[PDB]
Amino acid sequence: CQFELSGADGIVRSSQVEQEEKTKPGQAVDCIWTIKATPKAKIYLRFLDYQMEHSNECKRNFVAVYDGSSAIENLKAKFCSTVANDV
Amino acid sequence: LIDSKGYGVGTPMGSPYRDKITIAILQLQEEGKLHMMKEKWWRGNGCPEEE
Amino acid sequence: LIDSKGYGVGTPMGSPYRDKITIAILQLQEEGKLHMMKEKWWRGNGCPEEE
Amino acid sequence: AFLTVERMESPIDSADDLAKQTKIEYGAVEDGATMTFFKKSKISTYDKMWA
Amino acid sequence: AFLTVERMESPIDSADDLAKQTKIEYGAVEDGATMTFFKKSKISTYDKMWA
Amino acid sequence: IDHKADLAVAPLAITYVREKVIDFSKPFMTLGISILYRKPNGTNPGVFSF
Amino acid sequence: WDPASGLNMTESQKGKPANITDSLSNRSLIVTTILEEPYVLFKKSDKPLY
């Protein structure tokens, strides 16, 4: 369920899966998002709410941010601890 | 209260009486009877001279 | 105050830790570190300028 | 003097004052540990409280 | 009341008097060897500053 | 009881019913139930503030 | 001793090993706490804690 989300600003909706690709919660789920700014512009990411409660260990649930295209080349940050820095 | 420290009922290093005396003290505290004795002896002489 | 309870340290029935741990609790209590330990967490900001 | 250095004081200042007042409408946690004490407490200074 | 409550205001003139005050938020350029002085300090007033 | 653990250092009230089937060390701080209320405003009644 | 393997000397494991434990009473004590508010709360940090 890779989805586009580009422009000047926007809110990656909290658990936006019920309408894009309504998946059963029993199976493991994951959906990626692609962001593009205006021409000649970088991006600042600031979390407004984030709580991966079910563990403080990350083999199951987490959120990650990669720089550039959606490849493994250089992980900007995968964040699992209670708080989440801006990037 | 600047500092805290309690009182007790001393018994030798080995005594099968300590467990039951502890049970009894916790009992009395749950019924609050020792508070009644305290008020009988501290408050009992406590306020006969309300100024 | 109205009543009094006591927060304690559990231990399995008949385990020898009781008599080896109560002494440590008393050592900390009468050695003065316990009050600073309590204050370091209960303190908070304190009393602001309502004066 | 009053408008310069003003010190306001509490209406109620004791546990007993909560009883025989019938205007503050106090409360407690539902059937936690406070209710357990107020139940069966036979000092009767808190039986009005529980009533 | 206005005049004699204003006249006895005390503008801050020292670190400790600042520490007692609360409204004015503190700060420093982080990890520029300045805040670290508060980090590793032992003095009580600087400790509450760092807190 | 089932020995799957050991000394459980956590706020655990030393009450009568537990004491039969556990063992508690000596308390490391005391307790009690008390009132909680809002301290008063200087908002005078204004009926007769004189 | 050999050119290849080296010191195959028999004391590397002594006939009666000194370091033997016949007691399992105190190993990896399993304490137990709870998430009370100002008692035991998750530390506030950004990188994972282990």
Curated annotation (Swiss-Prot), chain A:
Where does the UniProt annotation locate this protein? Membrane
Free-text tissue specificity from the UniProt record:
Brain (at protein level).
Domain CUB span(s) in chain numbering: 1-87
Processing after translation = N-glycosylated.
Name which cysteines form disulfide bonds. Answer: C1-C31, C58-C80
Oligomer status and interactors: Interacts with GRIK2 and GRIK3, but neither with AMPA-nor with NMDA-sensitive glutamate receptors.
Q: What does this protein do?
A: Accessory subunit of neuronal kainate-sensitive glutamate receptors, GRIK2 and GRIK3. Increases kainate-receptor channel activity, slowing the decay kinetics of the receptors, without affecting their expression at the cell surface, and increasing the open probability of the receptor channels. Modulates the agonist sensitivity of kainate receptors. Slows the decay of kainate receptor-mediated excitatory postsynaptic currents (EPSCs), thus directly influencing synaptic transmission.
Q: What is this protein called?
A: Neuropilin and tolloid-like protein 2
Q: What is the lineage of its organism?
A: Eukaryota, Metazoa, Chordata, Craniata, Vertebrata
Which portion of the entire protein is included? 177 to 263 of 525
Swiss-Prot record, chains D, E:
| Cellular location(s) | Cell membrane; Postsynaptic cell membrane
Give binding positions for L-glutamate: A33, T34
Q: How is it modified after translation?
A: Sumoylation mediates kainate receptor-mediated endocytosis and regulates synaptic transmission. Sumoylation is enhanced by PIAS3 and desumoylated by SENP1. Ubiquitinated. Ubiquitination regulates the GRIK2 levels at the synapse by leading kainate receptor degradation through proteasome.
Tissue specificity is:
Highest expression is found in the olfactory lobe, piriform cortex, dentate gyrus, hippocampus, granular cell layer of the cerebellum, and in caudate-putamen.
Q: What does this protein do?
A: Ionotropic glutamate receptor that functions as a cation-permeable ligand-gated ion channel, gated by L-glutamate and the glutamatergic agonist kainic acid. L-glutamate acts as an excitatory neurotransmitter at many synapses in the central nervous system. Binding of the excitatory neurotransmitter L-glutamate induces a conformation change, leading to the opening of the cation channel, and thereby converts the chemical signal to an electrical impulse. The receptor then desensitizes rapidly and enters a transient inactive state, characterized by the presence of bound agonist. Independent of its ionotropic glutamate receptor activity, acts as a thermoreceptor conferring sensitivity to cold temperatures. Functions in dorsal root ganglion neurons.
* Further comment: The postsynaptic actions of Glu are mediated by a variety of receptors that are named according to their selective agonists. This receptor binds domoate > kainate > quisqualate > glutamate. It does not bind AMPA without coexpression with GRIK5.
Family of this protein: Belongs to the glutamate-gated ion channel (TC 1.A.10.1) family. GRIK2 subfamily.
Name of protein: Glutamate receptor ionotropic, kainate 2
Q: From which organism does this entry originate?
A: Rattus norvegicus (Rat)
Curated annotation (Swiss-Prot), chain F:
Which residues have a glycan attached per UniProt? N41
Describe PTMs of this protein: Sumoylation mediates kainate receptor-mediated endocytosis and regulates synaptic transmission. Sumoylation is enhanced by PIAS3 and desumoylated by SENP1. Ubiquitinated. Ubiquitination regulates the GRIK2 levels at the synapse by leading kainate receptor degradation through proteasome.
User: Which cell locations does it reside in?
Assistant: Cell membrane; Postsynaptic cell membrane
Tissues of expression: Highest expression is found in the olfactory lobe, piriform cortex, dentate gyrus, hippocampus, granular cell layer of the cerebellum, and in caudate-putamen.
Q: Which residues of the sequence carry a binding annotation for L-glutamate?
A: P11, A13, R18
Q: Which domain of life is it from?
A: Eukaryota
Family, as annotated? Belongs to the glutamate-gated ion channel (TC 1.A.10.1) family. GRIK2 subfamily.
Additional remarks: The postsynaptic actions of Glu are mediated by a variety of receptors that are named according to their selective agonists. This receptor binds domoate > kainate > quisqualate > glutamate. It does not bind AMPA without coexpression with GRIK5.
Subunit notes for this chain?
A: Homotetramer and heterotetramer with GRIK5. Tetramers may be formed by the dimerization of dimers. Assembles into a kainate-gated homomeric channel that does not bind AMPA. Can form functional heteromeric receptors with GRIK4 and GRIK5. Can form functional heteromeric receptors with GRIK3. Interacts with DLG4. Interacts with NETO2. Interacts (via C-terminus) with KLHL17 (via kelch repeats); the interaction targets GRIK2 for degradation via ubiquitin-proteasome pathway.
Q: What is this protein called?
A: Glutamate receptor ionotropic, kainate 2
Originating species? Rattus norvegicus (Rat)
